[PDB]
Write a protein that binds this ligand. Structure first.
Ligand SMILES: Nc1nc2c(ncn2[C@H]2C[C@H](O)[C@@H](COP(=O)(O)OP(=O)(O)OP(=O)(O)O)O2)c(=O)[nH]1
Ligand SMILES: Nc1nc2c(ncn2[C@H]2C[C@H](O)[C@@H](COP(=O)(O)OP(=O)(O)OP(=O)(O)O)O2)c(=O)[nH]1
Ligand SMILES: Nc1ncnc2c1ncn2[C@@H]1O[C@H](COP(=O)(O)OP(=O)(O)OP(=O)(O)O)[C@@H](O)[C@H]1O
Ligand SMILES: Nc1ncnc2c1ncn2[C@@H]1O[C@H](COP(=O)(O)OP(=O)(O)OP(=O)(O)O)[C@@H](O)[C@H]1O
Ligand SMILES: [Mg+2]
Ligand SMILES: [Mg+2]
Ligand SMILES: [Zn+2]
Ligand SMILES: [Zn+2]
Lengths: 343, 355
DNA sequence: ATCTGTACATGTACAGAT
DNA sequence: ATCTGTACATGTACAGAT
DNA sequence: ATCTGTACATGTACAGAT
DNA sequence: ATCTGTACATGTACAGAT
């Protein structure tokens, strides 16, 4: 049943091969252009992120997320009044004393659009800009559509901002050494605007990737000399439930896969033992993820996993009516054996 | 008994007062020696410090009176030639190391002799501290310092070559931690450098002064401090295990016996450290080292060790074909002697623990 | 004036002390 | 139970060099 | 600075076994 | 029906060379 759905969602080896080689041609050419032409982003480096590099992309390898990260030393940070995730940056990049996210992104966008016009072997265009968003999105066609988000990022090597001090609550699950080591990694700021044009937002995509590929309380979880768990499969199932619902209902435009990812990070913290995610218990595990997600809807509270005071389900971000609509749609699917999984 | 062994561990536990006093002096001497290696003409310029052994693994027992530190030198143009299929011993082939070269071959005893000479000269300029250099012992790398920081303290300075290439093929089937610490940990550990230290034997055999031996002290240190199958083992939000406690008790059994019986000169603490690495591989679950089962965990370690003695087989954990209990290293008479002494302690309530 | 090897500054796991 | 000294990893300042 | 070579993690695919 | 072993594929870390 759920097993059969996961067979449908599993990517095909041939499809993976053909998408990646086209994606990698385009990204390599873009990363070269940021370097060789003496742009203000010389030194930018590639960091692959998101579901495809975390091995939880479902259905088709048709959406790829790539970070172009740039070290900036002396990056004075001021919290955009009390939001937790949004900051103003202060002190080559002289043409952007506040580093305007909008101004930096636009020049980054301009460069990419120029380089895309010279690619003659791949059918690739730049998607119209979505306001406030941090991405430059590419639309590729090998006959099948593939989109690529190029995400500009500032990389800072100082200790993480104080609003994360209580985040990453992995101590009872991945442990204190893993937590201390992860917080010795840099933190990242991404030109996503708040509601304004100068604000950046923290990104922990690199930390989330590590967690996805090192998710057990036992070191051997899902390795060739350990036992499989069903953590990622539950994430896939929940991503699919939301993807299918978002296709149908325009009322759900405010929801995104990151809400499902955040909710399962909390569930993985609540239920740390690998035996609590036995493959034989896939249905129970999926159902308790559903119940926890519904509890977040009812209480209007889904805290950012790295930034606990930042409520992704606040009234300001998602209207109460949207959350009650999603609650009804999920409650219905749950009570009837998920008919939407058969479409 | 659960409570007998707990009281022994209390006797074994180091005191913070002693730790602080010993380490103040040790760090002063070591730093001064590391700095001297970095100046002017020194062939050892660039050498880096790596703290190793039981004190930095937190399994030193009774007193903080013996510290091990590696002075490691990266060497790039490195070709290795195995010494008679022994797995552990190598010739090194290829520059400040020119005066140690014997046409292509890097001489261990020539390099160690200069290293030792520089150290002895620097120790003579120390006025702060009562510290001298111990008479060289055959079979040992190590320049050993005897510090009389009132109480006696030994510091083994080990000269090491550092190579960043892939580990020598004699290790391909060693480090069998896949069912315990896992494949990602194993791959990450084998991406670290490997180390070569002087063999420095006086056997009179061919290549005597040009043979080196592999050292995995850094890997052992990581394993000691990341020893559980669960990542939270012995952490502040995890459960305590008794793995290190079993190591201390077995170390203590051997030290007490070795103090009394010169018949045991061939045995050393590395033998019990190797044995418990195998035991940790055999019983990988943290629940097989519950602190409530300290007695039986200690007993099963004794029994595994006794079987190694009687069958004359204790494979090096990193180099499986190298047998640390071969007849060529330890006489059958020495093994039967230790076996009876261990059997005796085991069956009469460990009276040697009360001495 | 700028560059850089050396060592201070900061943070916290481990484990003894109280 | 909390308090605390050592070891250690990484970031960053600057005297002396260039 | 840039780039290839190597090793093995993470995956999918499928036949034979269970 | 699931498990197991081999073959096939991409992603990622990092040594060494240029
Ligand atoms: N790697 C990475 N990609 C990000 C990050 N934030 C956003 N992205 C990428 C993938 C997202 O689907 C895409 C759009 O970002 P958002 O959905 O947060 O903002 P947008 O302005 O599109 O509107 P929305 O808030 O969803 O209504 O940009 C981040 O922190 N890291
Ligand atoms: N880092 C490191 N130090 C080592 C190694 N082998 C020996 N040492 C050092 C630290 C020890 O306290 C000291 C012991 O010297 P040896 O192991 O050469 O002793 P030997 O075999 O002569 O006699 P033994 O078996 O101990 O009775 O030398 C090694 O592989 N790595
Ligand atoms: N609202 C957000 N807040 C913070 N980080 C986000 C947000 N949306 C996305 N991200 C980060 O960017 C990554 C890529 O975003 P994207 O929307 O492509 O999701 P994903 O994880 O790749 O999953 P999928 O593409 O399969 O829906 C996320 O995995 C996450 O690290
Ligand atoms: N025979 C050996 N073969 C390989 N490595 C060895 C050998 N003897 C010692 N070593 C390495 O050198 C380190 C220091 O040796 P040493 O004899 O001081 O033991 P130790 O583990 O520090 O314990 P203790 O000093 O308390 O007896 C060991 O921990 C080990 O990594
Ligand atoms: Mg994505
Ligand atoms: Mg020692
Ligand atoms: Zn798993
Ligand atoms: Zn433990």
């Amino acid at each position: 049943k759920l097993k059969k759905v996961l067979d449908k969602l599993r990517l095909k080896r041939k499809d993976i091969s053909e998408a990646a080689e086209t994606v990698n041609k385009v990204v390599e050419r873009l990363l070269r252009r940021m370097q060789k032409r003496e742009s203000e982003f010389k030194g930018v480096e590639q960091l692959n992120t998101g579901s495809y590099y975390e091995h939880v992309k479902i259905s088709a390898p048709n959406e790829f997320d790539v970070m172009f990260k740039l070290e900036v030393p002396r990056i004075e940070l001021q919290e955009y009044y009390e939001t937790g995730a949004f900051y103003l940056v202060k002190f080559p990049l002289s043409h952007f004393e506040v580093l305007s996210a909008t101004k930096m992104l636009s020049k980054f966008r301009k460069i990419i659009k120029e380089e895309v016009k010279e690619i003659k072997d791949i059918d690739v265009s730049v998607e119209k800009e979505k306001p406030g968003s941090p991405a430059v999105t590419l639309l590729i066609r090998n006959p099948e559509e593939i989109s690529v988000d190029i995400i500009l990022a500032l990389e800072s090597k100082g200790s993480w901002p104080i609003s994360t001090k209580e985040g990453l609550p992995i101590q009872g699950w991945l442990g204190t050494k893993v937590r201390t080591n992860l917080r010795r990694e840099p933190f990242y700021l991404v030109p996503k605007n708040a509601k304004q044009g100068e604000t950046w937002r923290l990104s922990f995509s690199h930390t989330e990737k590590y967690i996805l590929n090192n998710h057990g309380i036992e070191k051997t979880c899902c390795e060739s000399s350990g036992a499989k768990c069903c953590r990622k499969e539950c994430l896939k199932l929940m991503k699919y439930l939301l993807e299918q619902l978002k296709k149908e209902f325009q009322e759900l435009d405010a929801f995104c896969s990151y809400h499902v990812k955040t909710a399962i990070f909390h569930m993985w913290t609540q239920d740390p033992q690998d035996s609590q995610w036995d493959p034989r218990n896939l249905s129970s595990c999926f159902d308790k993820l559903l119940a926890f997600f519904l509890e977040c809807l009812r209480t209007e509270k889904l805290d950012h996993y790295f930034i606990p005071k930042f409520n992704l389900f606040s009234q300001e971000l998602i209207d109460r009516k949207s959350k009650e609509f999603l609650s009804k749609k999920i409650e219905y699917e749950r009570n009837n054996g998920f008919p939407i999984f058969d479409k």
